[PDB]
Amino acid sequence: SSQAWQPGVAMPNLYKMQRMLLEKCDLQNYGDSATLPKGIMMNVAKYTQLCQYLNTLTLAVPYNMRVIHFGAGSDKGVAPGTAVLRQWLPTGTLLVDSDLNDFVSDADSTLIGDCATVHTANKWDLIISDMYDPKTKNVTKENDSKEGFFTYICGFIQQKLALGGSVAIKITEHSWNADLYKLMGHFAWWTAFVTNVNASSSEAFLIGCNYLGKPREQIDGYVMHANYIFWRNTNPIQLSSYSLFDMSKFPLKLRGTAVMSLKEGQINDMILSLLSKGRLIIRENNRVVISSDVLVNN
Amino acid sequence: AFAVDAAKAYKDYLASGGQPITNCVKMLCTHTGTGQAITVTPEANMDQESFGGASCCLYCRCHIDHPNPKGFCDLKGKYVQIPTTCANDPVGFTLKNTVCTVCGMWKGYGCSCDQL
Numbered sequence A: 001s002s003q004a005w006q007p008g009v010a011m012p013n014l015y016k017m018q019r020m021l022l023e024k025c026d027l028q029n030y031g032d033s034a035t036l037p038k039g040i041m042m043n044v045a046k047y048t049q050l051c052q053y054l055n056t057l058t059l060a061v062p063y064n065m066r067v068i069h070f071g072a073g074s075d076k077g078v079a080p081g082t083a084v085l086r087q088w089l090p091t092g093t094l095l096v097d098s099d100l101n102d103f104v105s106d107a108d109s110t111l112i113g114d115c116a117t118v119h120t121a122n123k124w125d126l127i128i129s130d131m132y133d134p135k136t137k138n139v140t141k142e143n144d145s146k147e148g149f150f151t152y153i154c155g156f157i158q159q160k161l162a163l164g165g166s167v168a169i170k171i172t173e174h175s176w177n178a179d180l181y182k183l184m185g186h187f188a189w190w191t192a193f194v195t196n197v198n199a200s201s202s203e204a205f206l207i208g209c210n211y212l213g214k215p216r217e218q219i220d221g222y223v224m225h226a227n228y229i230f231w232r233n234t235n236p237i238q239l240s241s242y243s244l245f246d247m248s249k250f251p252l253k254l255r256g257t258a259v260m261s262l263k264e265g266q267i268n269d270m271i272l273s274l275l276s277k278g279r280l281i282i283r284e285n286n287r288v289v290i291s292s293d294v295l296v297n298n
Numbered sequence B: 001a002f003a004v005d006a007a008k009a010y011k012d013y014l015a016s017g018g019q020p021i022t023n024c025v026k027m028l029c030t031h032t033g034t035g036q037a038i039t040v041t042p043e044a045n046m047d048q049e050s051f052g053g054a055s056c057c058l059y060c061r062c063h064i065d066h067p068n069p070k071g072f073c074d075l076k077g078k079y080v081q082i083p084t085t086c087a088n089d090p091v092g093f094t095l096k097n098t099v100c101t102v103c104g105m106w107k108g109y110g111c112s113c114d115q116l
Ligand SMILES: C[S@@+](CC[C@H](N)C(=O)[O-])C[C@H]1O[C@@H](n2cnc3c(N)ncnc32)[C@H](O)[C@@H]1O
Pocket: A043, A071, A072, A073, A074, A075, A078, A079, A080, A081, A082, A098, A099, A100, A101, A113, A114, A115, A116, A130, A131, A132, A133, A148, A149
């Protein structure tokens, strides 16, 4: 259908409501490839389509928006996705990125080290993660919920995401975490989004839209990942680069979303209503200070 | 007194027939932009490609100090427009060329300030 002209495909709600058993992911289009525009990296195309899809959600976009990007390096030593985020985000957005290995970046600030070493004084309006460990891709082992950087991300969302903020966390068949799916219930809305350029992969971005700071719905993350694999297993997605050729409405519209410093008592239902609509960010508006813990050794 | 001259080394490397630095990050864009050389968002025109600036800076890419006191980078955090006929070597292009301070265009590749 018309899906090939979208940036990608989001998990249909009816699949979220199932109670499937975890199965091996076996994609019909496995090994196919999209025809990328000449000279364009896979991850530029992939981040472009993710941002094109994010353009369709009720993201809060304050002045002096704060964005942090985990897993931003590559074996190329550069940061393709960071360049796309920098292009997508309004000018003046503070963009911090990070990776285990060293790389050169267009971000305003870059931290090298395990994500577990990263600390920030402030809260963030948008968290992007493309962290991935290729060792998870093992078809000879049970596919259990994974810890590692996923444990950090879950804590980082609960401690350092502003109310009304949003996240996009990359998962695969084997690179996933049950508590992250459970956390998706603490947003006004959530999905798993598959880009059209990488639709032959079990990769999706777990997108939590408008953080509420408490469970809106109870999600079992083992069941929901099984639900996600079932959707991917039974819905072949046609590989497509089409949306990459129309960049005229790409930039995220600077909405000037209100930022307010409220304490837990004053968050009433009307406030939660504004958060759910993309119309309020709750956090302090002090200075952005970050750091990376260094272990000292002989 | 001693200082490594990396620009000269790269230019000599290119003259010797060396492969230009790869993995400069090319952006998707409309290619209906102003054509100016270094911009806050991609500004390629029909004859240009837009690249993430850090990936096109020899000093960023080679992990060496930037060739000025202050150590500031003109490219990092920005987008650099490269003529499509030169986009095989964006690092070389930015090294060998200069931006007009009057109009934002590359001198020799879009600057027309020397015209009648
Ligand atoms: C799929 S690559 C990211 C590609 C990148 N986003 C791009 O635009 O090209 C995954 C990255 O996740 C990083 N990573 C994996 N585990 C990590 C961890 N525990 N802490 C920090 N980074 C990690 C790896 O170092 C690797 O660079």
